């Protein structure tokens, strides 16, 4: 038993809700919140900009030190950093950005990072400003993630479309 509430159950291990990942995180304090990161951990907009703002820019400060030490992530890769006031940990995952021409097949590699964590609150990778089809992203999530994932979908219209079209 865990503290997530109001989710619809899609599969054995995948759950979905129309919600603000920022407010969902501050209420739940999940062990892991997933950020829709880029390779530079520049948290300027979308989910990343929202999460970073909610941390009072502490996420960005920590991320800049990470990059200065380690260099950029790979597309499809991830790193674990602090969750600040939102979660114990933040798993920064780089899905391919279609608006940069990145290969959508790396979306499966991106979701594989979730399997290193037993339970996660997450957005749909490569959705929103990353330019992928959120319905494809949901299918890849369901077919790749085996751990327990709670997906927060900000847009109510999109949430209803994801549920109604789910096979
Ligand atoms: N659940 C939730 N909460 C927010 N506050 C929010 N903002 C943008 N998106 C959609 C989204 C999913 S992946 C993504 C980035 C790759 C660009 N953007 C949001 N989803």
From Swiss-Prot:
Q: Which residues form the Macro domain?
A: 1-167
Q: How does it sit in the membrane?
A: Multi-pass membrane protein
What activates or inhibits this protein? Inhibited in vitro by GRL-0617.
The reaction(s) catalysed by this protein are:
Thiol-dependent hydrolysis of ester, thioester, amide, peptide and isopeptide bonds formed by the C-terminal Gly of ubiquitin (a 76-residue protein attached to proteins as an intracellular targeting signal)
User: Which cellular compartments is it found in?
Assistant: Host endoplasmic reticulum membrane
Q: What does this protein do?
A: Responsible for the cleavages located at the N-terminus of the replicase polyprotein. Participates together with nsp4 in the assembly of virally-induced cytoplasmic double-membrane vesicles necessary for viral replication. Antagonizes innate immune induction of type I interferon by blocking the phosphorylation, dimerization and subsequent nuclear translocation of host IRF3. Also prevents host NF-kappa-B signaling. In addition, PL-PRO possesses a deubiquitinating/deISGylating activity and processes both 'Lys-48'- and 'Lys-63'-linked polyubiquitin chains from cellular substrates.
- Subunit comment: May form homohexamers. Interacts with N protein.
Q: What is this protein called?
A: Papain-like protease nsp3
Query: Gene encoding this chain?
Result: rep
Parent-protein residues present: 1025 to 1191 of 7096
